[model samples]
Target: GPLGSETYDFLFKFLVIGNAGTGKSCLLHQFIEKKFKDDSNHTIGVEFGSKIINVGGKYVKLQIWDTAGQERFRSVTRSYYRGAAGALLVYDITSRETYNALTNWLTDARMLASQNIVIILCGNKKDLDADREVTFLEASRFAQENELMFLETSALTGEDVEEAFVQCARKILNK
Candidate 1:
């Protein structure tokens, strides 16, 4: 392999950004561990995780960074946004406030990350559809208006979590 013994053709740095209680870490755990973790405590500084995946026949390793969502950690979390190839913005469909905060998250990512950063809007906790406070139509409209990729996922049920990450990686590679 041209790279290290790990044999990954590309190493992508990704940041998971969202409001507190929006399931950013849950989505991260579901993507890397392939299992949902509901009892995990809040992140303090930043949590690191990685997974090697295939994109267009090329092995791409995702170096993921999950940051603390609390307002107090903005300075700490803002530092992680640099060098990020992709940013996954998450919001809980059951909480309208999280969804409404998308612009703030997007602004932070846009300001801190590279101009070419691939941004994906994720509506998490899809399993809580019955309790959804944010409608898919509204979310989709917001994503469309911003010209961003979007998807609904459930860390609890392990639905669309992998697809969202893989899609973002593919987008980063192709575009």
Candidate 2:
């Protein structure tokens, strides 16, 4: 696996954000191992996962941060943004509230993350289309307005999960 075997140049940090219980942890888990069920607990503070990936011809390390979405845990996660190179703003497709809160979430990322950080807005749980409360276009338009790279993915199906983190890295290099 070139992704695992390569000697990387830059360590890119990505901070994830969404509302409470919105499957942020599940998305990060899927991005890491390509699988994780259980819909389990919310991240308590900040949990991280990393993968060495090939971007164009360069080997890069993707350092992804899954931050606790609860309000009380805000301060602790904020510091992880110090050297962040990406921001994966996540939202559950079945939750309208989570979609609406993205700006404030982006605000938190902006305050601590780098100016050139690659921000990718992800609409997760696309496999649950029957429960879709947020449309792709809604998320797409939001991304367009904010100039974020966006995608709809499913952790359960492993749909475009790894593509997102890797693509975000590529976009960072493209910039």
In candidate 1, the residue pairs with backbone N, CA or C atoms under 3 Å apart (3 or more residues apart, or in different chains) clash, namely none
Assess candidate 2 and give its lDDT.
0.82
Instruction: Compose the digit string of candidate 2's lDDT tens values, residues 30-126.
Output: 8777777574776789888887888888888877778899999977876878888887788899999998899987877777777666788889889
Error of 2 at 133 (Å): 1.1
Candidate 2, position 108, lDDT:
71
lDDT of 1 at 119: 91
Q: After superposition, how far is residue 98 of candidate 1 from its true place, in Å?
A: 0.3
Top candidate (TM-score):
1
